[PDB]
Curated annotation (Swiss-Prot), chain A:
Involved in the restart of stalled replication forks, which reloads the replicative helicase on sites other than the origin of replication. Can function in multiple replication restart pathways. Displaces ssDNA from a PriB-ssDNA complex. Probably forms a spiral filament on ssDNA. It comes from the Bacteria. Signal peptide: none annotated. This is Replication restart protein DnaT.
Curated annotation (Swiss-Prot), chain B:
Residues 1-72 are annotated as: C-terminus. Residues 68-79 have a biased composition (Polar residues). Homooligomerizes. Interacts with PriB. Component of the replication restart primosome. Primosome assembly occurs via a 'hand-off' mechanism. PriA binds to replication forks, subsequently PriB then DnaT bind; DnaT then displaces ssDNA to generate the helicase loading substrate. The chain holds residues 84 to 162 of 179 of the full protein. Involved in the restart of stalled replication forks, which reloads the replicative helicase on sites other than the origin of replication. Can function in multiple replication restart pathways. Displaces ssDNA from a PriB-ssDNA complex. Probably forms a spiral filament on ssDNA. Belongs to the DnaT family. The lineage of its organism: Bacteria, Pseudomonadati, Pseudomonadota, Gammaproteobacteria, Enterobacterales. The C-terminus (CT, residues 84-155) forms a 3-helix bundle. This is Replication restart protein DnaT. It comes from the Bacteria.
Length: 72, 79
């Protein structure tokens, strides 16, 4: 895991226990995040150019996948 | 905003009167689209690659947000 704040990068990965951490932030991911879902998140946030800590990135991913799965 | 059909891109935004337009497409929205909701939509469709006119992107955003909020009394989840 990287320390400090960083911008999004193509090889970024959430933690191996992301689903457990997602539930901690109130997000129930009954099936794991797919490569397609993670790659979409990464490509978008690379464009945004914002920097966060790894934990804040994982929270945004959780909420993003929660919204995208609850739609359509 | 590009002319014709275009692929979703990170800087895209619906129109300033989106909530009105959405209602006239039959989609009530109790609150404006949030920044989290817009970013999830754009990220998803920027990766899907399909192209639509701006009006169709807006119609898709409207119904996507209505469906997503429907389990929460029609309210967005707070950040």
């Amino acid at each position: 895991i990287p320390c400090g704040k960083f911008a999004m990068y193509p090889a970024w990965q959430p933690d191996a226990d992301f689903q457990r951490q997602a539930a901690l932030w109130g997000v129930a991911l009954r099936e794991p995040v797919t490569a397609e879902e993670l790659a979409a998140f990464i490509a978008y946030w690379q464009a945004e150019g914002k920097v966060f800590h790894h934990i804040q990135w994982q929270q945004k991913l959780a909420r993003s996948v929660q919204i995208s799965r609850s739609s359509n």
